[PDB]
């Protein structure tokens, strides 16, 4: 079942921390490139992620950062994932060095769009789709990390809505106003995160506050188009933070929507 021996892991290079602290590179059975989050004791729901651990091993989709496995008979867990050699997509987005196409860009949007769509079939809420929440694989390809990691963070700061690490940036204003948490509340994350992308990795609503962003968005108002998304691009993005929840489109439909910008341009 989901349970990996921790004999069969050998942790190797740190990869950084994060909000259940620690994530390792290691080799899983002496062959398979693992990242391996040793969860801080006191930062997770343990039982509920455990119980709920089961669920998330049936979500296997090519642009899902794959569960691999858990080590839950010790303390602290394990959590056993899917290497990604590039790392964070937010820091990758920000290496000049790159110096991306814009089909390139389209094309990690498509990656990112392909992981929800399944995510959605599966009636699956990710709570914080960002790009410091994708990760990069060796071939350049986009997976979605964490996804519905969110229920298992203990630390108020970043699950109250008033929290100095609640990810408002990425929230549409039901759940700022009232905690409408929805399929479409992760469409909306999805916008904020193609335009993160076509920014190279600007903060969104870079000169405001967190505050000043909910007012912001409250009055109606936008994230301005990045530079490098033509005017199809943006109207995607733009369709994703309509005031009205049940007028954003579905996963579904903003997949065939960047294809058909991939085909006209
Ligand atoms: C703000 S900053 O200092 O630029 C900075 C911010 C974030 C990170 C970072 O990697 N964070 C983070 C946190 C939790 C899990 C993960 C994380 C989770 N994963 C799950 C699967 N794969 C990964 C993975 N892959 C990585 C991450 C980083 C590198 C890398 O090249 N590094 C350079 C040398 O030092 C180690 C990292 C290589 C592969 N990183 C990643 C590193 C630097």
Known sequence: SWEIDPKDLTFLKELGTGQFGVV????????????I???????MSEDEFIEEAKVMMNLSHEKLVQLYGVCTKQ?????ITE???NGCLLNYLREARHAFQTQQLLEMCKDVCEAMEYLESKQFLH???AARNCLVND?????????????????????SSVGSKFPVRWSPPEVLMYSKFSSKSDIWAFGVLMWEIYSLGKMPYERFTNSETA???????????????????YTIMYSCWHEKADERPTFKILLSNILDVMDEE
């Not at 989050?37 to 930062?43: H, L, Q, V």
């Not at 303390?75 to 959590?79: K, L, S, T, V």
């Open 24 to 35: 390792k590179y290691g080799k899983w059975r002496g062959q398979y490139d693992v990242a």
């Open 37 to 43: 989050k040793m969860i801080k004791e006191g930062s």
């Open 75 to 79: 303390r602290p867990i394990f959590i």
């Open 83 to 85: 290497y990604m050699a």
């Open 127 to 129: 709570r914080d789709l």
């Open 139 to 159: 071939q350049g390809v986009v997976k979605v990390s964490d996804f519905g990691l969110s229920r298992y963070v203990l630390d108020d700061e970043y699950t």
């Open 215 to 233: 007012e912001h968005i409250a009055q109606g108002l936008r994230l301005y188009r990045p530079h490098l998304a033509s005017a199809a691009v």
